[PDB]
Amino acid sequence: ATIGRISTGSKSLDKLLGGGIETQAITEVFGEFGSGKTQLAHTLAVMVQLPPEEGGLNGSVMWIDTENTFRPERIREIAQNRGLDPDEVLKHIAYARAFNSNHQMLLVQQAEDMIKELLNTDRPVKLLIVDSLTSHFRSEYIGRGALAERQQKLAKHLADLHRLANLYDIAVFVTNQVQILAHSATLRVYLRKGKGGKRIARLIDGEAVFSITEKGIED
Numbered sequence: 001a002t003i004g005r006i007s008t009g010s011k012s013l014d015k016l017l018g019g020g021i022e023t024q025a026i027t028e029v030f031g032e033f034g035s036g037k038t039q040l041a042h043t044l045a046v047m048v049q050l051p052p053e054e055g056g057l058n059g060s061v062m063w064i065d066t067e068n069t070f071r072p073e074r075i076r077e078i079a080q081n082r083g084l085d086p087d088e089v090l091k092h093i094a095y096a097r098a099f100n101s102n103h104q105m106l107l108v109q110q111a112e113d114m115i116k117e118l119l120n121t122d123r124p125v126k127l128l129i130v131d132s133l134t135s136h137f138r139s140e141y142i143g144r145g146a147l148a149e150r151q152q153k154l155a156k157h158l159a160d161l162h163r164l165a166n167l168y169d170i171a172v173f174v175t176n177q178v179q180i181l182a183h184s185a186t187l188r189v190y191l192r193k194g195k196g197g198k199r200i201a202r203l204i205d206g207e208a209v210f211s212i213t214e215k216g217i218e219d
């Protein structure tokens with residue numbers, strides 16, 4: 001199946017990404033607390049629902065939240081300000097709180113049921129968000145011996161996510177709060193605060209600049 005692309009809301013960031021975030025890929029955004037990772041996730045959860053000529057995939061969303069940071073009213077605000085019905089957009093986001101890393105891993109396996117259910121509807125799942133990918137792993141696997149154990153568990157979790165992305169033509173978007181370890185995401189984007197309230201994004205193989213606004217993010 002051909003890759004799809006989802007606009008982030010920012011032409012600058014879309015260009016950095018080669019045209020938007022890709023299906024059949026895991027895109028990891030990482031950066032310090034407050035760098036805008038969750039705002040980008042909220043924006044993508046709206047953008048993916050747009051029709052393709054507007055930068056979406058006519059898609060539905062599954063969201064795994066590990067920090068209680070999902071805000072339904074932020075979805076509704078972004079949707080309304082982009083001309084979409086806020087309640088329809090919110091309804092197309094399946095939402096689950098992950099209580100610990102083992103529950104987070106089960107939830108990814110569980111997500112396959114809804115993905116299959118929706119695959120041939122007019123709004124198949126096209127975006128799976130894990131925010132935060134790493135927070136539970138960081139709190140639970142700590143101390144001597146934890147590096148190998150945590151990396152092995154994360155590798156299995158990411159393998160599960162890669163399979164869903166690749167098998168069902170989904171963009172997986174994950175967040176990671178940071179600041180030597182290996183990573184298995186398809187593409188890693190470093191996000192940081194800049195001057196004038198801007199956020200700056202760099203690929204970790206130019207820089208994109210965007211603002212956080214009532215439309216989510218934009219140039």
Ligand SMILES: c1ccc2[nH]ncc2c1
Nearest residue numbers: 062063094095096107111
């Ligand atoms: C992950 C995210 C949202 C979800 N809703 N139901 C199951 C599930 C898994």
